[PDB]
Scaffold this active site. Structure first.
Site, PDB file in Angstrom:
ATOM      1  CG  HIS A 125     -25.653  77.086   4.023  1.00 56.93           C
ATOM      2  ND1 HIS A 125     -24.417  77.434   3.517  1.00 56.93           N
ATOM      3  CD2 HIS A 125     -25.595  77.331   5.354  1.00 56.93           C
ATOM      4  CE1 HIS A 125     -23.648  77.872   4.498  1.00 56.93           C
ATOM      5  NE2 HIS A 125     -24.338  77.815   5.624  1.00 56.93           N
ATOM      6  CG  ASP A 152     -24.023  83.749   5.454  1.00 52.16           C
ATOM      7  OD1 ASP A 152     -23.834  83.496   4.242  1.00 52.16           O
ATOM      8  OD2 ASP A 152     -23.344  84.597   6.087  1.00 52.16           O
ATOM      9  CG  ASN A 165     -21.667  83.681   1.616  1.00 53.76           C
ATOM     10  OD1 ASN A 165     -21.714  82.625   2.246  1.00 53.76           O
ATOM     11  ND2 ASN A 165     -22.577  84.019   0.707  1.00 53.76           N
TER      12      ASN A 165
END
Ligand SMILES: CC(C)C(=O)Nc1ncnc2c1ncn2[C@@H]1O[C@H](CO)[C@@H](O)[C@H]1O
Length: 371
Positions: A96, A270, A300
């Protein structure tokens, strides 16, 4: 080539990046597998379980990072781990990078070769390493939504499936991708009256076949979204736009016209969340109030079921782990275009055009490092 697996170090990250099965397959092919002691305890994998599969268990994180040519992780490296990044190391994990310029700069400055689980992508468009996490997050979404509908949790006090003669919960899933399909399936399994919205009618067509009409499907116009959300007890936001940050489909204005004590679960959190008033929250304090409704935006999510999700993640990564371990990053990415699409950094070069746009950083065409 040595393969190393350290203990995950982020808050409440209980998963581990390999199971004994993956260790036994790596060990069988003549690779050393270094695992930090206790790395699998969060997923009910004991130090003895790893050792018996052939892993060389190691006392500290420092030795794993130092001796491993291929380093498998679950989450991105945090600040305390930037000093461990090495030039001759392949890091394979969820990265990410668009969400952290500091992590991106740490990888680049290290010269390390990193490959992101979430952009590994096959020719048909699928993300085979993100998918098991989207599956887990969907199924979790229905069962945490169910819980928070209980009056003792600030919810409206509505049982998911009702009982004979009493109205079931009215559940709206927005988005019929991997996550929404799975959320819809469990919510319907619990007896709820489930309506799934999407702009892709083919996805709706699949849902209509698979549950024979029992899961209701509606084309996701702005009008239809507002209507169903107003009548819902539980709204599950499952629009995980790949790469793009999630659009705000449920505004705080629409939240104020919701049923009192309705619950919103955002499993796109997320990616910043697909609700306007969504803010990433934690496992201790999971919910917050928005105009007498309850918002759930825990990020998460799959980490809360690590016994399940460690296996779902590493079943999916294992064939790429074997290719990397047997051939190294360059030959493996040459042979496998899906793995190539995950290439993120190499020797100071950022290899993802999306990340490089989002951060304003020199973008290096992936073909230059592979051919
Ligand atoms: C009114 C506007 C704001 C709207 O209706 N937006 C959407 N409503 C329902 N579904 C949507 C969606 N934008 C994408 N999706 C789907 O979510 C899945 C994510 O994997 C994809 O299948 C994708 O098609």
């Amino acid at each position: 080539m040595r393969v190393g697996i350290p203990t995950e170090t982020k808050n409440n990250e209980f998963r581990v990046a390999i199971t004994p099965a993956g260790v036994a397959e790596l060990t069988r092919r003549g690779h050393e597998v270094l695992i930090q002691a206790g790395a699998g305890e969060g997923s009910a994998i004991t130090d003895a379980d790893f050792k018996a599969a052939g892993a060389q268990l190691v006392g500290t994180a420092d030795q794993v990072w130092a001796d491993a040519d291929l380093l498998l992780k679950v989450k991105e490296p945090i600040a305390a781990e930037y000093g461990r990044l090495r030039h001759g190391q392949i890091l394979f994990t969820f990265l990410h990078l668009a969400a952290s310029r500091a992590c991106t700069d740490a990888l680049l400055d290290s010269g390390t070769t990193s490959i992101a689980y979430e952009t590994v992508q096959t020719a048909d468009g699928a993300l085979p390493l993100l998918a098991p996490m989207s599956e887990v997050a969907g199924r979790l979404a229905a069962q945490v939504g169910a819980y928070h509908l209980m009056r003792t949790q600030g919810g409206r006090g509505v049982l998911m499936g009702g009982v004979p003669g009493v109205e079931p919960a009215d559940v709206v899933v927005i988005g019929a991708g991997t996550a929404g399909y799975n959320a819809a399936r469990i919510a319907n399994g619990m007896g709820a009256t489930v309506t799934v919205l999407d702009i892709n009618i083919d996805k709706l067509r699949q849902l209509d076949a698979e549950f024979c009409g029992r899961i209701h499907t509606r084309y996701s116009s702005a009008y239809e979204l507002e209507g169903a959300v107003k009548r819902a007890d539980l709204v599950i936001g499952a629009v995980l736009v790949p790469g793009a940050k999630a659009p705000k489909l449920v505004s705080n204005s629409l939240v104020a016209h919701m049923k009192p004590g309705a619950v919103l679960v955002d499993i796109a959190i997320d990616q910043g969340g697909c609700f306007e008033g969504s803010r990433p929250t934690t496992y201790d304090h999971p919910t917050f109030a928005v105009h007498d409704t309850l918002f759930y935006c825990v990020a998460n999510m799959p980490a809360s079921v690590p016994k399940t999700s460690t296996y779902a993640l590493t079943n999916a990564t294992m064939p790429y782990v074997l290719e990397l371990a047997d051939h190294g990053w360059r030959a493996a990415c040459r042979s496998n275009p899906a793995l190539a699409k995950g290439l993120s950094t190499h020797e100071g070069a950022l290899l993802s055009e999306r990340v490089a746009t989002d951060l304003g950083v020199p973008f290096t065409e992936p073909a230059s490092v592979l051919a």
